[PDB]
CSV table of N, CA and C and ligand atoms in Angstrom, one decimal:
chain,number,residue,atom,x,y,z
A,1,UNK,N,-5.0,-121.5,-145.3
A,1,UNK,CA,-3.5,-121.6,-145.1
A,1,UNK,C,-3.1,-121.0,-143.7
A,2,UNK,N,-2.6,-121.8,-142.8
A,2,UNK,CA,-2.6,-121.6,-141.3
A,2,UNK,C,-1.0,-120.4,-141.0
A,3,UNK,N,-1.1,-119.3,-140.1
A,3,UNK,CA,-0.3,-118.8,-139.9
A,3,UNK,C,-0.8,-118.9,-138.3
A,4,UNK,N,0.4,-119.0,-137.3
A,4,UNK,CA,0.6,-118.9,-136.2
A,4,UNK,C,0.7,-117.5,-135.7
A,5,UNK,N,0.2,-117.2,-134.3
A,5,UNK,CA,-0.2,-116.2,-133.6
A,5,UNK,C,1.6,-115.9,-133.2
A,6,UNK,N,2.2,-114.9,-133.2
A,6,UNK,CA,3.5,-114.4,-133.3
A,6,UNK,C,3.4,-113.6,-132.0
A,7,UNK,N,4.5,-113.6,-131.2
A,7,UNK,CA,4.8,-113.0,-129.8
A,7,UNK,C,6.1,-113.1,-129.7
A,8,UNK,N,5.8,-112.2,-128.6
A,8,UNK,CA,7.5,-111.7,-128.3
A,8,UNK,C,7.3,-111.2,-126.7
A,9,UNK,N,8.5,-111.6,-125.9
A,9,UNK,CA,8.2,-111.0,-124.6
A,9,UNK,C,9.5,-111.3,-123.8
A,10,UNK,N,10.0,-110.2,-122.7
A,10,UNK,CA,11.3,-110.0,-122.3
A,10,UNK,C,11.1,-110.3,-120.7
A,11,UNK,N,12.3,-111.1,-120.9
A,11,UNK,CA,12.6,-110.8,-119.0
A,11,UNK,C,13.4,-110.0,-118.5
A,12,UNK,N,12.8,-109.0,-117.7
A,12,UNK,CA,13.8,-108.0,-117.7
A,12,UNK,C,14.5,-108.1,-116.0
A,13,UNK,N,15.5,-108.1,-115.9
A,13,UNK,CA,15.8,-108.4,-114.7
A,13,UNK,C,17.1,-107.4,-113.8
A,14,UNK,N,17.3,-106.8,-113.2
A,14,UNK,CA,17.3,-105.7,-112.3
A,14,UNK,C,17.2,-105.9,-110.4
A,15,UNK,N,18.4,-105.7,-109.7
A,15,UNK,CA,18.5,-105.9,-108.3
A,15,UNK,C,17.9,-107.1,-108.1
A,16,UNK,N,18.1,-108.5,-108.9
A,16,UNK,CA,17.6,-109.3,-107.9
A,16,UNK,C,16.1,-109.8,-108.1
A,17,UNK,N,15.8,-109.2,-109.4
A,17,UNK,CA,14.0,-109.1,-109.3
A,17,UNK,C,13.9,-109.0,-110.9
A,18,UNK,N,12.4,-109.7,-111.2
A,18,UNK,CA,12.0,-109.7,-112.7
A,18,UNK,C,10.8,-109.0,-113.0
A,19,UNK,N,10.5,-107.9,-113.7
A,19,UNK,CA,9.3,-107.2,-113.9
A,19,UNK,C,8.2,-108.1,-114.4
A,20,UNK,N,7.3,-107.6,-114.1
A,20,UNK,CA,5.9,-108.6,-114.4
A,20,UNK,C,4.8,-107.5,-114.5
A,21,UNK,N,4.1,-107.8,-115.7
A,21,UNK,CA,3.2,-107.0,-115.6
A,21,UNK,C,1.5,-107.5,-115.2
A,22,UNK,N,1.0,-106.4,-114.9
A,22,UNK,CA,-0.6,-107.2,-114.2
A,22,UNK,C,-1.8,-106.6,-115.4
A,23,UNK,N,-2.1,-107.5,-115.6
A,23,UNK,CA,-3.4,-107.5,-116.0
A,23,UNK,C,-4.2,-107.9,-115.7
A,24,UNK,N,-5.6,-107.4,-115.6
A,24,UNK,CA,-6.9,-108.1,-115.1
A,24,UNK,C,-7.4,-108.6,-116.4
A,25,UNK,N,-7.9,-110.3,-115.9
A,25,UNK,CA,-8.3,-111.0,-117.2
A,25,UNK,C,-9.5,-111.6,-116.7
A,26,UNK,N,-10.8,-111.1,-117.9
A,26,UNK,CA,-11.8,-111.4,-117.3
A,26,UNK,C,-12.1,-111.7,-115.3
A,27,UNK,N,-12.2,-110.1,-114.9
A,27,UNK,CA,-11.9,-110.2,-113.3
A,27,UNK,C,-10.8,-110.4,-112.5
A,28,UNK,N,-10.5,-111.1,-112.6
A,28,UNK,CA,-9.0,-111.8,-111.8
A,28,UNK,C,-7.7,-110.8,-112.4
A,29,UNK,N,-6.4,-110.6,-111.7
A,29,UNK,CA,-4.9,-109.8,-112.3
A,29,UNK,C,-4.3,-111.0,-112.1
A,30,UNK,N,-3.8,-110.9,-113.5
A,30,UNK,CA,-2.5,-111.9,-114.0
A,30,UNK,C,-1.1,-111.6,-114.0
A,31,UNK,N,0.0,-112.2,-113.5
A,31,UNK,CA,0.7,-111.3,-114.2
A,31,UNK,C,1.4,-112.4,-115.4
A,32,UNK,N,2.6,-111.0,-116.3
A,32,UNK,CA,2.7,-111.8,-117.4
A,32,UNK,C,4.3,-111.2,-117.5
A,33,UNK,N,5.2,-111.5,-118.3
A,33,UNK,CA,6.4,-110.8,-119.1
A,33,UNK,C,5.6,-109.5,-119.5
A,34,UNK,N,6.0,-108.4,-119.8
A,34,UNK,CA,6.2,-107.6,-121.2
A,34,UNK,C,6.2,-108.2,-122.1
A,35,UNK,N,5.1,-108.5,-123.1
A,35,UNK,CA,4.6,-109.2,-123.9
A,35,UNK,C,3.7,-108.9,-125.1
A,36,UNK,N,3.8,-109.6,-126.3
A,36,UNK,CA,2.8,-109.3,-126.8
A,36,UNK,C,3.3,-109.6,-128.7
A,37,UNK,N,2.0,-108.9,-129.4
A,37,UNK,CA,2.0,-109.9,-130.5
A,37,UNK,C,2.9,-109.0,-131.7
A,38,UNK,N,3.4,-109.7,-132.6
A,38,UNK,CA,4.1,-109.0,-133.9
A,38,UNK,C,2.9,-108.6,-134.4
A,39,UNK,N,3.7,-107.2,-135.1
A,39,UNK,CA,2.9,-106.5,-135.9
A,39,UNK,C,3.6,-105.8,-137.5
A,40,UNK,N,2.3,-105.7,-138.8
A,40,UNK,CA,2.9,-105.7,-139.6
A,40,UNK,C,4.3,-105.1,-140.3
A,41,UNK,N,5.4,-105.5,-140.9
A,41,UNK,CA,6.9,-104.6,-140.8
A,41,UNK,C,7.3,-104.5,-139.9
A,42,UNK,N,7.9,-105.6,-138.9
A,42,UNK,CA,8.3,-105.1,-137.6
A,42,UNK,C,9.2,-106.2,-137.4
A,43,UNK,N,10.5,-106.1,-136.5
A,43,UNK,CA,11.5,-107.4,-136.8
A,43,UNK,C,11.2,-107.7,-135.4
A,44,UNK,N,10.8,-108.9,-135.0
A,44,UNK,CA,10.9,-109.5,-133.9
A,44,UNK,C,11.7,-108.7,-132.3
A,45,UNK,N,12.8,-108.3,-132.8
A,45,UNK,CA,13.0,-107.5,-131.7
A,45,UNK,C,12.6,-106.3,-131.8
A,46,UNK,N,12.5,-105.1,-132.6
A,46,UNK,CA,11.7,-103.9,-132.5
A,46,UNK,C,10.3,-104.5,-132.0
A,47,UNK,N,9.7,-105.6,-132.1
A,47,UNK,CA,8.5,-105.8,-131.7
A,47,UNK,C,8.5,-105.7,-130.3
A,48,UNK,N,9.4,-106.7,-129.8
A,48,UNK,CA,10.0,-107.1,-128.5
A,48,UNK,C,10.2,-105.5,-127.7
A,49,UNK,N,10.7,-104.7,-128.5
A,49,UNK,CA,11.5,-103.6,-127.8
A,49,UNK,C,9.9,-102.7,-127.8
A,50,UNK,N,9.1,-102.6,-128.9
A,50,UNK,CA,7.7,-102.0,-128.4
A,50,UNK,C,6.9,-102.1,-127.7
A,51,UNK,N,6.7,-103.9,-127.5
A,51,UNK,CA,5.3,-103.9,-126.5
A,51,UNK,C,6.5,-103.8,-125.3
A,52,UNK,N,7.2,-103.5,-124.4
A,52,UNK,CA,8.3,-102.9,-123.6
A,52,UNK,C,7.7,-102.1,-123.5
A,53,UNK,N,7.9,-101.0,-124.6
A,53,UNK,CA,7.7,-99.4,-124.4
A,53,UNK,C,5.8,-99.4,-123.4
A,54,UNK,N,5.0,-99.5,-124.5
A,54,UNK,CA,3.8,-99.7,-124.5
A,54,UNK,C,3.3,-100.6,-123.1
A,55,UNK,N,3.7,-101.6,-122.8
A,55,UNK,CA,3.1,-102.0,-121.5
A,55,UNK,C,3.3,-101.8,-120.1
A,56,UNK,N,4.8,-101.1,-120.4
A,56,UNK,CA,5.8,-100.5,-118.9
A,56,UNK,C,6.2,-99.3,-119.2
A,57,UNK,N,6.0,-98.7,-120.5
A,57,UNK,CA,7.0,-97.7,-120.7
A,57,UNK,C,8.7,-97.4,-120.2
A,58,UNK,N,9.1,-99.2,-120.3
A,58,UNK,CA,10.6,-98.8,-120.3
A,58,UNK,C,11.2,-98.4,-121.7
A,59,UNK,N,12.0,-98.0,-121.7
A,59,UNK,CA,13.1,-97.9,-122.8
A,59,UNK,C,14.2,-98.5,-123.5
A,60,UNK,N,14.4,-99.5,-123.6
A,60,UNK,CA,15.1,-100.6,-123.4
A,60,UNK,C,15.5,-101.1,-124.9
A,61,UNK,N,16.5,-101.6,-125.4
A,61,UNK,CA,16.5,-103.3,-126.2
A,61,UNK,C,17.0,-104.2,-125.8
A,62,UNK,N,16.6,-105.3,-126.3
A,62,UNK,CA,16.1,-106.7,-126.1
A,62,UNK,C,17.7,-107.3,-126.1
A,63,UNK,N,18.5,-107.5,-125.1
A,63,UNK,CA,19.7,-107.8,-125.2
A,63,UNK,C,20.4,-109.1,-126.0
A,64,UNK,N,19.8,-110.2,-125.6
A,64,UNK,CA,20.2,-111.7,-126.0
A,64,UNK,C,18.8,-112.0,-126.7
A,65,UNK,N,18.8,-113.6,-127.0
A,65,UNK,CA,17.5,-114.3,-127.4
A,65,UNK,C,17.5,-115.3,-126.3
A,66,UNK,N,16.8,-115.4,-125.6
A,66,UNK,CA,16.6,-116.9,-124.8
A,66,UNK,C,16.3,-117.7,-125.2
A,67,UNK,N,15.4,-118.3,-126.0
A,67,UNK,CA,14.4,-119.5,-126.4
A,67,UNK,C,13.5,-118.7,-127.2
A,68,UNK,N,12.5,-119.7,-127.7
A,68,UNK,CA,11.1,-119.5,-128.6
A,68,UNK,C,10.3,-120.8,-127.7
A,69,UNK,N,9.4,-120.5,-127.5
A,69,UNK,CA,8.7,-121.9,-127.2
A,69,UNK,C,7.1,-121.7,-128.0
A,70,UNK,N,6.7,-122.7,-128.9
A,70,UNK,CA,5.5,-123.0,-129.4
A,70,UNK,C,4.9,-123.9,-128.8
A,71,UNK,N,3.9,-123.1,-128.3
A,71,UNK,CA,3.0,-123.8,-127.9
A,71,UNK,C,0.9,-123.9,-128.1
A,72,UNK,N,0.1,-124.7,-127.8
A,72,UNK,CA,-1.2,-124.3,-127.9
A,72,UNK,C,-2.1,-123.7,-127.6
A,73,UNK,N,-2.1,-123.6,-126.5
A,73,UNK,CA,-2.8,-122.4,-125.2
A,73,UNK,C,-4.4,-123.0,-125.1
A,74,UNK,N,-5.2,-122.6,-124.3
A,74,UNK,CA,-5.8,-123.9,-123.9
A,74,UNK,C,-7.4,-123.5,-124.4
A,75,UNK,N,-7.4,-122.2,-125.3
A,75,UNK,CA,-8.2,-122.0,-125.9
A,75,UNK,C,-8.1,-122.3,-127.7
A,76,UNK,N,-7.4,-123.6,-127.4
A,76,UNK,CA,-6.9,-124.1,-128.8
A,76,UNK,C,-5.9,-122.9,-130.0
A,77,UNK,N,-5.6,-121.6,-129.7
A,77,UNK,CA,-5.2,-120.6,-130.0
A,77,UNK,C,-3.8,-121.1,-130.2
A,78,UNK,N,-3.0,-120.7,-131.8
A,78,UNK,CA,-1.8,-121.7,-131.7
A,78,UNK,C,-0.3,-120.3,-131.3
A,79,UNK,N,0.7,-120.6,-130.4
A,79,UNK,CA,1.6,-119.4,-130.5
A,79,UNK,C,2.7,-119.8,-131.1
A,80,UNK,N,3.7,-118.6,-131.4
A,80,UNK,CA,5.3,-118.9,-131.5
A,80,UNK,C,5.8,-117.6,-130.8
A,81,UNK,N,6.0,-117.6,-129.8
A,81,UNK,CA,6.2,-116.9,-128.6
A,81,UNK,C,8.3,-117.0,-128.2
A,82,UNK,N,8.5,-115.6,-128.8
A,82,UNK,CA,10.0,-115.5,-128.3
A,82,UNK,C,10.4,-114.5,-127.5
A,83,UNK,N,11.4,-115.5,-126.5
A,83,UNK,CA,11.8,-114.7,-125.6
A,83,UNK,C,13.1,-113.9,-125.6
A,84,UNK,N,13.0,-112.9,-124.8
A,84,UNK,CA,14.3,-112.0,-124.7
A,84,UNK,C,14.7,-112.1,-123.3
A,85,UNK,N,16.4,-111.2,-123.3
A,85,UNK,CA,16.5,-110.8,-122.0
A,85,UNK,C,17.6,-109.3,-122.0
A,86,UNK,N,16.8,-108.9,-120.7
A,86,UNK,CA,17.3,-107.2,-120.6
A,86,UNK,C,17.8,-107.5,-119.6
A,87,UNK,N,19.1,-107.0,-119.3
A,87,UNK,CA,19.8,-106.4,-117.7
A,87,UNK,C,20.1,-105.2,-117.7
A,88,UNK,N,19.1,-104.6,-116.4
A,88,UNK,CA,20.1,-103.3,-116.4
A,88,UNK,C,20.0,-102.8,-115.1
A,89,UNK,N,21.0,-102.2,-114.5
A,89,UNK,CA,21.9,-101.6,-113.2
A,89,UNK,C,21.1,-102.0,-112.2
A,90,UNK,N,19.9,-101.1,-112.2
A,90,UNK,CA,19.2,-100.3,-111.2
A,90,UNK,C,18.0,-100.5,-111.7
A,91,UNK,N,17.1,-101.0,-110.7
A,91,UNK,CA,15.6,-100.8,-110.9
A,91,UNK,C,14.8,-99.4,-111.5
A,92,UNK,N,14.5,-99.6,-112.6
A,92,UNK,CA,14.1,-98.0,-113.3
A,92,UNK,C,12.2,-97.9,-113.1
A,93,UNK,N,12.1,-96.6,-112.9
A,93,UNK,CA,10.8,-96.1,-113.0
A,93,UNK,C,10.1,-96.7,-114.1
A,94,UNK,N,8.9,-97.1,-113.7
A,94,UNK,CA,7.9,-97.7,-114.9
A,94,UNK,C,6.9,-97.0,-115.0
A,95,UNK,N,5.9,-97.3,-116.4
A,95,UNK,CA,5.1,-96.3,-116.6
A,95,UNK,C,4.0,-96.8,-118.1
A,96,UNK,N,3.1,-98.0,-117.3
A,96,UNK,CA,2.5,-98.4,-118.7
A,96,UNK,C,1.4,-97.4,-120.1
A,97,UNK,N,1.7,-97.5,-120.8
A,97,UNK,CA,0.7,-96.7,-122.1
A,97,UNK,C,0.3,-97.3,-123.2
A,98,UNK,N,-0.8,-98.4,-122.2
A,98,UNK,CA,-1.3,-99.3,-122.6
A,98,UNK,C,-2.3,-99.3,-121.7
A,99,UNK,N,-4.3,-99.4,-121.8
A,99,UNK,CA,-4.9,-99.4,-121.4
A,99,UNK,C,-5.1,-100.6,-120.4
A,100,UNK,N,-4.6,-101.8,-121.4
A,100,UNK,CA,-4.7,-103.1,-120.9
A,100,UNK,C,-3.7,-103.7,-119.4
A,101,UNK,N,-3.0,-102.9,-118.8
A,101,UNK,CA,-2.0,-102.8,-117.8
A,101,UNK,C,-2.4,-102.1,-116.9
A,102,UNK,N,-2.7,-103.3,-115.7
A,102,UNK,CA,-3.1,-102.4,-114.2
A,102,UNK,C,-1.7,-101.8,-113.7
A,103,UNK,N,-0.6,-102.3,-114.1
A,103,UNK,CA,0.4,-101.7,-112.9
A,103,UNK,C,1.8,-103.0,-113.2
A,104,UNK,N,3.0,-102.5,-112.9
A,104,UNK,CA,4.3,-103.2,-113.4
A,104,UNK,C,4.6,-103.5,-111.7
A,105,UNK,N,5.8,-104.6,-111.9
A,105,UNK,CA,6.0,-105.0,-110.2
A,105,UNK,C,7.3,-105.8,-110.7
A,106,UNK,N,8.1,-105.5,-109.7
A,106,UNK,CA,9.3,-106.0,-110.0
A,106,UNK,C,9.2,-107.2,-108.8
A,107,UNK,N,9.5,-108.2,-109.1
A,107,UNK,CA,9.4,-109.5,-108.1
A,107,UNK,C,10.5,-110.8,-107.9
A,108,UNK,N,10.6,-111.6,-107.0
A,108,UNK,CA,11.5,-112.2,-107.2
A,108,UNK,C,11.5,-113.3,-108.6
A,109,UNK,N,12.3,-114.1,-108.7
A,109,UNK,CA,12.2,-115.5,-109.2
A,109,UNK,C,11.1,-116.6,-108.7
A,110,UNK,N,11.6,-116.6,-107.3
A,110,UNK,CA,10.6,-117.8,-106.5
A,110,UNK,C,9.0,-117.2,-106.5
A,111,UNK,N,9.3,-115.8,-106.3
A,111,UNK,CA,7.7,-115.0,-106.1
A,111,UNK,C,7.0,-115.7,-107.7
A,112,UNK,N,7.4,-115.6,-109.0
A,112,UNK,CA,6.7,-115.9,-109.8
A,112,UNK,C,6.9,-117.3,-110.1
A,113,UNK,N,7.5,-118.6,-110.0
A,113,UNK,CA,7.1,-119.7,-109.7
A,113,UNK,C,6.3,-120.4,-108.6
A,114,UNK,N,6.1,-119.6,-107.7
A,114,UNK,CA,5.7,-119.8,-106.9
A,114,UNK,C,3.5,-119.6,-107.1
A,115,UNK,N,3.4,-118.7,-108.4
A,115,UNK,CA,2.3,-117.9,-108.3
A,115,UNK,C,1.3,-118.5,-108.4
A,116,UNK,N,0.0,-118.0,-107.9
A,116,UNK,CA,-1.4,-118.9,-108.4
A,116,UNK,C,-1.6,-117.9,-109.4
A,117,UNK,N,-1.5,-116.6,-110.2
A,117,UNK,CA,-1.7,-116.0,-111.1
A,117,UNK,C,-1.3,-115.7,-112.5
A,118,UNK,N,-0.4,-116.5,-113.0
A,118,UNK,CA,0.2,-116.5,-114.0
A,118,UNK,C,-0.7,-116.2,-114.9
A,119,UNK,N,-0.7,-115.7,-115.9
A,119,UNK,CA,-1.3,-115.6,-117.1
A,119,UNK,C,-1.5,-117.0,-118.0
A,120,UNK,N,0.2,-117.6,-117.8
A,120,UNK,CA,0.1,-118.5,-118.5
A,120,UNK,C,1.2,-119.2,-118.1
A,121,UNK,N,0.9,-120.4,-119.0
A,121,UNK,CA,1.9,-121.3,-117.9
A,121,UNK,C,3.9,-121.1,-118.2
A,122,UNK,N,3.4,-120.5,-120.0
A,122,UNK,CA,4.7,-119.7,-120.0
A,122,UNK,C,5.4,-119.0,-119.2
A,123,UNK,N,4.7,-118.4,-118.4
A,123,UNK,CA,5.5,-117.0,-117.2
A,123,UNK,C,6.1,-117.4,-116.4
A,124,UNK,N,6.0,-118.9,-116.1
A,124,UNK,CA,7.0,-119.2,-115.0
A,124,UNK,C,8.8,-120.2,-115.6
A,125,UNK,N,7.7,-120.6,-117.0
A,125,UNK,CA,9.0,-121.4,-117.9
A,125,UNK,C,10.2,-120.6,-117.9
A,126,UNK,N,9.4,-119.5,-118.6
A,126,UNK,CA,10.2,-117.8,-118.9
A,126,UNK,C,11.9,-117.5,-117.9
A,127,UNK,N,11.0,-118.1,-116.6
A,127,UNK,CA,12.4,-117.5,-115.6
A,127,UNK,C,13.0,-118.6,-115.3
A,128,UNK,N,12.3,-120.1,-115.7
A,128,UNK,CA,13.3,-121.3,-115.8
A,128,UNK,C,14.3,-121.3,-116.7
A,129,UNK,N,13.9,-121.1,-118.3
A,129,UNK,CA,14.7,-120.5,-119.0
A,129,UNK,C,15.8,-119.4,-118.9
A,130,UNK,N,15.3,-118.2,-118.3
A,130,UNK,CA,16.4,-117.3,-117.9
A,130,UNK,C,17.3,-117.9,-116.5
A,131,UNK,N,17.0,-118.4,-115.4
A,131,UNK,CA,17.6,-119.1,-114.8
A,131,UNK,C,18.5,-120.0,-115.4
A,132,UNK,N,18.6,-120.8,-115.8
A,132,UNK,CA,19.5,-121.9,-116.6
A,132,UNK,C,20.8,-121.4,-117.1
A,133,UNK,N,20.7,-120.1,-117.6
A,133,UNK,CA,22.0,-119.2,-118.0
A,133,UNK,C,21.8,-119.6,-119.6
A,134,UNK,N,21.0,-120.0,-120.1
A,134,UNK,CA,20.7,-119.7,-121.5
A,134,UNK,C,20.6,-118.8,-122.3
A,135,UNK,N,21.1,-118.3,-123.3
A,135,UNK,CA,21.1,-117.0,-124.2
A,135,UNK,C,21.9,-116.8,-124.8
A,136,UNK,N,21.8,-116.1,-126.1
A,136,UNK,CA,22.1,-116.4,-127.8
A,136,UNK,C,22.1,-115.1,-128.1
A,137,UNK,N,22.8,-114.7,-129.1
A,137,UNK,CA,22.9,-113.2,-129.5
A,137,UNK,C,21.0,-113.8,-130.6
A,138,UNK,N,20.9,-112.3,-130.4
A,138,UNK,CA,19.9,-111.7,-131.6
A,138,UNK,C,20.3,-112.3,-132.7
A,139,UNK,N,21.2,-111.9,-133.2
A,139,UNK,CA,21.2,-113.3,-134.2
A,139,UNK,C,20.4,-113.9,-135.2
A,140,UNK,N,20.5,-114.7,-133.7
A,140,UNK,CA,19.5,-115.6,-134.3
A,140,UNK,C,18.4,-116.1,-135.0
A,141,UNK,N,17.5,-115.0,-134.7
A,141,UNK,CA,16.2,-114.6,-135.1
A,141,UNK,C,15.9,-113.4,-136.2
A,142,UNK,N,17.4,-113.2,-136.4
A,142,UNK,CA,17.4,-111.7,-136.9
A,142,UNK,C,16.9,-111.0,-138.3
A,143,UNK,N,16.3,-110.1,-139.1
A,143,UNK,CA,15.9,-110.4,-140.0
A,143,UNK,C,17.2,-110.1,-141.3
A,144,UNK,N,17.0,-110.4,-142.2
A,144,UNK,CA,17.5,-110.9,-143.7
A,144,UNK,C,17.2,-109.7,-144.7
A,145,UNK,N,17.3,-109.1,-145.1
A,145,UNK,CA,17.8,-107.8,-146.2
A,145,UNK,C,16.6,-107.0,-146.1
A,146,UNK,N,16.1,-106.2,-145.4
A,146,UNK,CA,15.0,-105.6,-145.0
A,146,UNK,C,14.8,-104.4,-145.6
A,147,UNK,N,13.0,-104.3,-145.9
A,147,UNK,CA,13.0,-103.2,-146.5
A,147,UNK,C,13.2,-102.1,-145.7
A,148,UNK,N,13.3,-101.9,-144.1
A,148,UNK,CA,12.9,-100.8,-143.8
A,148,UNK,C,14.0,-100.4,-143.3
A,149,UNK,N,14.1,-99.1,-142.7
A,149,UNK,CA,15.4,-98.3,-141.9
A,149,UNK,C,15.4,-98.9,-140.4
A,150,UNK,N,16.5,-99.7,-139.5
A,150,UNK,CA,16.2,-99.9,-138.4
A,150,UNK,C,16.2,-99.1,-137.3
B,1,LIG,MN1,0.6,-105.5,-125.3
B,2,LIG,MN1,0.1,-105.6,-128.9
């Protein structure tokens, strides 16, 4: 009985610039959104709002919904990958606490369409999407009579 690989990831955007995080993947540094997979009891945006914490150590919640995009990935691996978006003032201090994160980088628009390093081909949709002026309240995705305290 097939369940899909569940993700969540934010664009967070500040002076003009969108954080991206670097990872080295097998050798090579990627970069990617603040990103990453749901985990058990967790609503889509607390998820959203943790791997935040955990891969940049911002502080943050997930302001709008942008999109969801499902896709395959090219290790046949199936996702449902939803996007957020954060605005805030001033470029803030980052600080990943996450082993898997060489280092956070706030960059343009064009800098990450432009990139030979994307993680995936999502990273650059991500800021097509946020470009476009698309976004939806939370809402949307939001969870339905839940057991836990939010
Ligand atoms: Mn992560
Ligand atoms: Mn994770």
């Amino acid at each position: 009985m097939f369940k899909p690989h569940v993700t969540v990831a934010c664009v967070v955007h500040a002076e003009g610039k969108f954080l991206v995080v670097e990872e080295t993947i097998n050798g090579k540094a990627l970069w990617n959104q603040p990103a990453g997979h749901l985990e058990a009891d967790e609503t889509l945006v607390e998820a959203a709002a943790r791997e935040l914490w955990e891969e940049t150590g911002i502080s943050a919640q997930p302001q709008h919904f942008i999109r969801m995009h499902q896709w395959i990935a090219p290790d046949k691996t199936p996702f449902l990958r939803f996007l957020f978006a954060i605005e805030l003032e001033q470029i803030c201090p980052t600080q990943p606490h996450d082993s898997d994160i060489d280092c956070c980088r706030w960059v343009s628009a064009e800098e990450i369409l432009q990139a030979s390093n994307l993680r995936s081909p999502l990273v650059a949709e991500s800021i097509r999407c946020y470009q476009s002026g698309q976004r939806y309240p939370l809402e949307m995705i939001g969870d339905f009579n839940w057991p836990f305290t939010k």
